[PDB]
């Protein structure tokens, strides 16, 4: 199907990009129910800038039109044991995000689920867990609680809730 993200304002069709990566925060606390939760990054521009996969377009949560991985999805972090350091996820296959111009951007549900499954598999091996849950943003200012990006001198804010709501065993 199709996951449609509401954006304000309406991005023109030429602002369609490829998702080349994303940046996540590992949820703290215990639980210890053999599951590890992840949300889009609760950090700021320092977290984004130090992933070194961005490209020319300034964006949050998702990397648009950036560097792609060589073969497999590759995850990195300055310190896996510090839930205050973000986890840079570099994709090997980009996921196109098509802006219609009506006030929403659409991505293929199938392509996104397959990307998440590969991200979960790489996350599962790094934290030695069994279940990986993606949850929406914990909150924050509009540029960071939304997937926000720069295109043609205008700034756009898109709700990313529908992109981070799955469980993977």
């Amino acid at each position, epitope marked *: 199907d199709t996951i449609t993200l509401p954006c304000r304002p309406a991005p023109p069709p030429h602002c369609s990009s490829n998702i080349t990566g994303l940046i996540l925060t590992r949820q*703290g*606390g215990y639980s210890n129910a053999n599951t590890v939760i992840f949300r889009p990054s*609760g*950090g700021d521009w320092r977290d984004i800038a130090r992933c070194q996969i961005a490209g020319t377009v300034v964006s949050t949560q998702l990397f648009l039109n950036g560097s792609l991985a060589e073969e497999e999805v590759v995850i990195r972090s300055e310190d896996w044991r510090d839930n*205050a350091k973000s986890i840079c996820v570099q994709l090997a296959t980009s996921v196109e995000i098509a802006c219609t111009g009506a006030g929403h951007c659409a991505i293929s549900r199938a392509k996104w689920a397959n990307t998440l499954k590969q991200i979960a598999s790489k996350l599962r091996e790094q934290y030695g867990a069994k279940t990986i849950i993606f949850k929406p943003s914990s909150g*924050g200012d509009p540029e960071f609680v939304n997937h926000s990006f720069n295109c043609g001198g205008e700034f756009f804010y898109c709700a990313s809730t529908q992109l981070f709501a799955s469980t993977w065993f």
Partner: antibody
Amino acid sequence: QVQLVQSGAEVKKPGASVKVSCKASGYTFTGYYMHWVRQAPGQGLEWMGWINPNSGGTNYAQKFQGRVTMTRDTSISTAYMELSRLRSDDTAVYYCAKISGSYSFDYWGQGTLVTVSS
Amino acid sequence: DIVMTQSPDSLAVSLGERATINCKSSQKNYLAWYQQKPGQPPKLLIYWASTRESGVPDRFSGSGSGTDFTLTISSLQAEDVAVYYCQQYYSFGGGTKVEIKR
């Protein structure tokens, strides 16, 4: 000199909501993450979560997801912790604490006693 | 997010004698030690496992690596009676209460 000054003691009925504040001074407020730690009377230290003052992003311990909300106002250098749906075992001293570059808490608020009772 | 275990939970030391507190994680070294007195927030004593905060008397020292860590008060003074916590990342130890043995 770095100072973290918190709001006064509160008494609240079970199921209400408390909003603790913490005003920072003497350092660049948006430059360090602010953490919240609580301590039940005679008990240990329990980490609740952090907030990034630059973006307002937060990361709560799973125990408090849904009940806790951390915010900040950069124009007055004040961080806020709000705990909702209070129970008696939420009675504790609530501390804001500023992380350092050594991943230790070198400056703490003076603490905010929150008593939950009918 | 790990679990820090502090032993012992309570420690009675004669005046002038050596006190040792142990802290191990269930998994450089970012261990910090704190001193808490009644009615007061914890006060940072040691960070990076062994670096002493400014104004902290020499009789306080920490050591250890990996998963075992130690706080040592070489000559216990009356003012050192308090609860001591270790901290690694955002997990605290349960605390060790240090008192005068008589």
